[model samples]
Target: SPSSPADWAKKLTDAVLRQKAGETLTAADRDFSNADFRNITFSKILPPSFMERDGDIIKGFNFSNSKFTYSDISHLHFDECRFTYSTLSDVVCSNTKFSNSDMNEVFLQYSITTQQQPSFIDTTLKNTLIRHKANLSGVILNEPDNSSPPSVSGGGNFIRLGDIWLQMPLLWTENAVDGFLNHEHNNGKSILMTIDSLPDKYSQEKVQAMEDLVKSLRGGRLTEACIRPVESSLVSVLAHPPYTQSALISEWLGPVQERFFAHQCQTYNDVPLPAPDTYYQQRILPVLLDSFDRNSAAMTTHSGLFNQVILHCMTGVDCTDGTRQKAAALYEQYLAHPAVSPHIHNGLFGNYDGSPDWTTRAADNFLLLSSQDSDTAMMLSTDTLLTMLNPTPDTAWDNFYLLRAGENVSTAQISPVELFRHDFPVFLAAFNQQATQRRFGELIDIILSTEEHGELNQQFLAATNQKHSTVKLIDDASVSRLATIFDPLLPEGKLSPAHYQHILSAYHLTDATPQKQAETLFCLSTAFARYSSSAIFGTEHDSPPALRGYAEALMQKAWELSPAIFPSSEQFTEWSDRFHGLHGAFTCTSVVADSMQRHARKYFPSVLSSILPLAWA
Candidate 1:
């Protein structure tokens, strides 16, 4: 051999060292053509045209970990070379060709260049760090496949220059610029001039281009024009069977789905309300329902796309007669979907999990729609309402729908009392499970005030008596327990006047005997007075004694109405004995004595309790 390739590499390295030492090295001085320059450290300022000569290009060179700084290598051709982890800083490489080379992890920092920046044709620049100040204008970033394109993440920066062309060698197109802009918009640019710039006809290249474009615009705003491209891209991608099954596609569609909703709602606002009807019915609905159906097997496993889809369905957009009917039908289908049905059932029953909140929100949205249109409310089938109400201690959303249905339907069609009665246990169960005493009281108030009927009271009495009654006579212990439950209603300033009237009306509506009515009224009066006396007697200043007078007056009326049932004496013990004997339920003397003592002690502590005696009498 004339000289082995290793000998040529040594000579080349020596020539560059001599050149850096101020010795001019011509092309004849070093000819490393067609040489294997692997594992070589060339720490010299290499001549600009040292690697190329009369008729040959520098081919099969491995300059990895080689230092090429402050050197002119412009117009130099790098063929099938490896420059991995090489530092090309402040180096002039204008028009330099890095064809079929590995330039990965190569730091191109502060490198000054012209319009003819370095070209990377069929090159691997995976994880190449490029600084913003580096002029990469007109740089050809030709990758064999779009996968693992160069990442310009230098100090959290992107390749901002518009002239840098990312050519997908596999999917060659003249619309690469438009594709780039689309990608940029999808990454998070809400407004872009080129969103609708692409042709309407679908192509794998176009879809892939748009998909890549969207992938780049991860957090971008999806504008009106932007929405269609993305939706179409998603549909196109989903139309391909195996791609539809890809987790990657699902993940991608998740945010796209969110943007779709956001854009749809935005579009709804901009155009006349009816304009979105066809869009919802034609474009958006079929695609979303298709995605939902396609991903039905994995609905629960995924979050982003699945959640957005569920949310879109729940929103009831463009909720016309046809829309509501279709949405309701689809929703029923969703309720039966294995992935989410259990969760829907759980959420409806107040057992919140991943899926319940969406279910509740959907129910709320449907109910809201129903409230606006009686016809719309009527459109919801009885089976739907039954399914909604089947859950125990139903969500407030479910109750709202129930109340709404009751409001819309005729009494002849469905008895409000019977409807309320059917759901009363849910409310009662909710009372026990409520987070706060105030909420419990509010639920109780809602139940009592919902509808005025003896059937409601009878249902309540039956439920309470069923639990408390042993062979028809109310158990004393159960009576005491139930009495404690009403204690919240007796606190002064706590119960609203409407609530008081409702309670009074409820007692009057009950079909109990006269003695039972009197007994219940006395029990209520005693509880009311007991709580009322505390606030009345505790007040330091008597502006007018309105509340105190109100309590005394109400109790006075109670005694007058049930005189024969009350007692003969003003003594607390005598009243208690008579109350216990008449009701045969719970002893009321302690409660009465406590109230009277509180009032007497506050008004007349030592004068033979004359105020207490007079107040009771």
Candidate 2:
């Protein structure tokens, strides 16, 4: 035949290159079957028209197990080129076309720039391995029939510009635009696309399933099939990391499901086939409560579920004693554990002040629990009340429970100064006019006492002076003296209307000279008139007449004891006019007329003409 097979292949390559433009090399001309083309450099050696002879196409060439490393095969056309089990590493195949080629088991581990990715039209790639390092970004695979799809199972990235196929369990697809796709085969577990990236069709389907399950629960159709999948899906959704939504579902669902469940507990009097009580005891309560383990991520990740369970249990549902006990235990665990408590605390008191109703619902549930158990009541009352006093900015949720606890606990348990310092501002912000008035009354009832009354007055004066008095016009001693006398006269704190009248009686006002008493009376009338005029004229109108009468009598006595106590008659007349508007002219006229007649009797010869007409008219 020849000197050797290797020598014969070298002679054959030379013969193929010597052919002219219209010549071709066929299988019959030079057989490449089982040829040793190892380490062959075919750059610029193969003719462009090698696959055609006299304008007739010749096909089929076997290059199996060949090495084409660092070779240039640009613009070369191949038909039925058997490149099976061959190494095409570091080869420049730009614009090279392959048709009906056997590229099976070929290793294309590397490539040139973007222009070097070979085009495979109608190519066979049953087990071809193309790594991402091969620069397949613009590579084309035009086997549109989905037959004999290429396997990019090379363990590294495999990016290309066409519809790509992946095998199961090992191969997965992550599109540049579609995020993660394809479900894990084990129980249809998925890689969980983000909420923002979740496709509309899939999300709507799951959401609809959740709605149907809720409806069945409300309609007393509690079943394993209806509840299991929905519960599992919700658990799955919540278990995912990085929750950024306001809620897993809308305001009507998700975080507020506790209210919905509570409502259903009341409305659906008749039990279902399985019975609502049995369903909760068996399916719902166990799952929800078991999830409340402090060590579990579910405690914080799925807080909404826990809240709903707690509320439902306390909703006077036909819940079993065991269920209620479990709920209480879990609630205590949540309050005590640092890992789980912050989520609830943040939900209650976070910067965003949106869901006060939810906070109130939680508070109501806790209140009911506390009412049933003395230990729970003490824990809830003490913990929440302490948080309310000197509360942090994030303790807004504590205010609800604090107010609720106030209804149950003894007023002596609370400190007056602490309540005024911490709890006052939040009550002003959260309570309505009627609620605020009612709560303020409760506060005064708790804080005012004989021993604590002066200290309480001092605290109020300090607060008022700190807030309103930027510049000091009066001496510190005078301010303290004035506070001591006028503090009891102010219409706030533990002093009731009856108590106020008793303080202003003749007995308490004695042991002082006429001038000192006049100054004291003048100060008392001014302070009393200021508060009564404002407090009574607002939406609240419950000022006591006895208190107002004492104020007017005090003012008349101050003027009579020391005529120069007031600046002028005109000023006193103006003060009386403002007081009249607040205390009503009918009441003020009688009190003023009585006081004027008494004054006229005391100084008739000197001031009768000046005071008689004013008293009579």
Candidate 3:
């Protein structure tokens, strides 16, 4: 029997060594069992092979801040081993087994973990769990402090610098990538601290104390709390447009569902179920309706307050019969109020922007309304102008004006309110079908069609003739190509800020002037001519390949036309040259890379193919 923890560790280590060397000592090949080996760092170590091992139990083994370089540890079984603040660099450990292993702040840099079946599926009782997983792709760890703590001075730091680690997906969609890069923002001390410190090496009791401290300091409890605030902030931001635009009814409802799911609430299958209308009348209608009638500033505030209360009831989280009754009475009062007609109409056009407490008040109302009867959604959505967007307008049209400029009809002629109505499914279909693909084409067209000659040429001439600008001559064709590329997608009329950047960046243009917009358009036209013949769309079986092919070709032409927007400055020119070289390298790697490269490469060729052999003289 082992008297001390170290003795047990030594015994386990020897057993593991023997197991690695194919010399079994017990019924199980690996003997790392029943040891309190906490707060320990294995520096530049290689894990032992235990292919024939079974029933291995590792109790409280800490491998924190350990480095594994160029190692193959594919046959090890990890059970309850804590790997915090560890770096596994350039290692190949595919087909390994890890069960119930607490791996926080584990740096996996350029490590491959794939075997015949990714090494994970080979075990009898296999499990692979990733927690607090940070991106560590393409990280060059040869630099100093590869996983070191930041100095107090906060300057002249070197700790695994690579943009690849920053490119991890956040909120990735099949079509959209909407999140900040790691290097762009939100990378700092707490993240580094969690990956730097190793387990303390002292007496067995002292080691346990240190391990407890580490666990407490970097525990998931605080992290979970931190995540809540972030999620709340995102919810708040997403809520704004939908609530304000009213055109965003579907968008708003989606977030409402998200919030409900986030809080772990049961969702309504088909909303606005018919319940006791008497309960609604007795409780919620009175106060809400009455407040709406009294449209003084005081009344508006009171109305908002009731709205909050009613929304809370809708959530069903802490809802009761009394709460339900109160909400119903408020709504009844709101409907019966004499001033209700003017109040609803006036509220629509009112600029409630300056109210400091508006969002908070609105959020409260939203939560309450969501929690209450789905009928509340019916009231808010249908009763307002929001119904115009929907195919079947809500029955609230009877109570309110259905048409923006229609004459007054008798209440008898008014239609009954439809229970469930929204416009999302149609819009979603339209958006997915054409919106993104159309936008891509428009972006390219705008880039190519921007002004390269006339005003821009004059400006170049003035800058060079009078100011002696550096360029030998401005590439007018390049600018014109970019403008032509980007023309189709400019918001049906004028260009937006996003369109402007896409054109300038794509073509590597020197001029950042709005006057060059036409030149960009011209360049786009030239590029579009190159691949407009072979564009593909949807799936090969669905939409005609020629249609999609034309769309892609046009977009690619636009993409190519994009680079010519910039003047041939030494700095920009050098960068463009480097990018083009890498673009070729990327093209050779795979189909996706090749397509991306081709998208950029096609611009110059398109312009050249269109005009190069023609008579310029």
Candidate 4:
């Protein structure tokens, strides 16, 4: 084919070396094999030789069996070039297209490349030592036509196209992937670069299929090699097309569903649970939540999945921003999904699902989702729980209803008064709205409304303002209607002692002129009457002694603050009677039980029940 093959190779190499980078040189093709091309930058205009062209099929380039050392093959078109038995070491073939190239028996070791992977169309690389990764992005190892894949041994040679190799993962067949995985240097990240690089040069189907294969290897060694790639690959698939692909996300995460759904479908060799935590902090959560929201049917099982999600996505330390909001949204879905509701463990929802930590955003989500339950929110635990056969809104009302901590305290009876009582302040503190006076005022307003003091609640709402004109208020009929709320028996819908203490020490008493003080005290007194009403019903024929002392304590403070504000001495004394419980005394005692006293309720019941076993009843 050539007058002198070696002479042709020498002349071409010499010719290219003599041409400057941007200069143009012209010639044609002939034989140039079994020799070397050294230290030459192939100027884009290098003589086009050795290439044969025809209809719909183009081929040629006879640099085969030769060595290319320290050369730049930038932007070259090597369509179906004969690279058989050749070695390309220490060269830059960047941005070079090597389509339909015969790379069999060839070696691409110790070379540099661009973001492109060494792609070949209908090319077979059998017997090649692929010490480095190829061009920017394409590969289909072992095409169906009996082409044995190259032996993928890794060295620094493959890192360029390896990065490119990862940018596109379609190079392997089922067995080809297995074989590649077995490479001594096939560390998991050996071929894992940016997943973002795929859509740039690949189809969604290609990336997804490759993703599914890598994920199938999850049962891989619990070691670094198999685990990292599968993990990285799965996260990669989830990240792109997150919205529409949400359903697929559910399967990959089914293992994380806490045994509620998917079992360990593959042996992770016990790799640390896949890093969904890391992923959750990224843009992946919308897809996760979208699966539950838009594609819930894909979830075959939900109980443990819901519970596991409680810890994983809903309540993790780093779970924040849009991620937590999305998880917070799951709470709303859980609230409404009849299918999902029964599976949610109350204990898990409380101590685990909703606990650990919270941000203002999450805290707001907590209340906004649950707060919609409103006043009877205490009773969402279902089964209404409290059978009110006992006809007494007095002490009977206090001792009447309940909720969860155990089987006896059903979750259906989460005491809203107590629930809101504790968490509003928690939110206040978390949201920086903490202030005793403010929280106290809210508690009193809650009491009045819960107690049916329609008039006084309106009056009280106005009272807290810097100016209030309660035209006609604090009358005897109003006090009579106050009836009684408590310091009662059971723990449903009851205000704490500080709520009353707010009454005793409201607004510092002296901040305003006596007229406004009188009006404020008058409003405070009406609430006091309502709280003290329990005195007459305490079964002691008088107020319970603890209650009587509360009456006396308020009695002492009110008269001490100023008696002119009282409805009248007669009415004050009568109110004081209830405060002291028909003989009400001082000491509005709300002693917080210490550990010993608390355990007295917890343990002393055992002691007394032992003595009079009926006491247990």
Specify the highest-lDDT model's number: 2
Candidate 4 global lDDT = 0.38
Cα-based lDDT for every prediction:
0.39, 0.40, 0.31, 0.38
Higher-scoring candidate on TM-score, 2 or 4: 4
Candidate 2 yields a Cα-based lDDT of 0.40
Instruction: Give per-residue lDDT, candidate 3, residue 164.
Output: 12
Kindly list the per-residue Cα lDDT of model 3 for residues 1-617, writing each as its tens digit: 53544454466666656654566455443423333333222222334224335633333345554545555444455655555555544455543455455444544432322221111111111111121123222111221223333222212212222111211222223211111111101111112212211122212322222233223323313333333323322232223322223333334335443443334211112121112133223323333323233433322223334443344344333445555565555554544344342222322322222111122322211111112222232122312322221112122333332211222223465233221123112222222223223333334344334354344333321221111112221134543433443344443433344655665555555465433433344334322221221111111011222222222333333334443543334423332232223333311112221233343345433333221111110
| Model 2: how far residue 426 lies from native, Å | 49
Summed backbone clashes in each candidate are: 8, 0, 114, 31
RMSD of each: 30.3, 34.2, 20.7, 29.0
RMSD of 2: 34.2
Tens digit of per-residue lDDT, candidate 1, span 503-580: 556433445455444444444444334322321221111111222233343444445444555444464344433333
Candidate 2 Cα deviation (angstroms), residue 173:
16
Off by over 4 Å in 2: 1-28, 34-41, 47-58, 112-114, 131-617
Best prediction by TM-score: 4
For each candidate, what TM-score against the reference? 0.22, 0.22, 0.27, 0.31
Residue 209, candidate 2: Cα error in Å is: 29
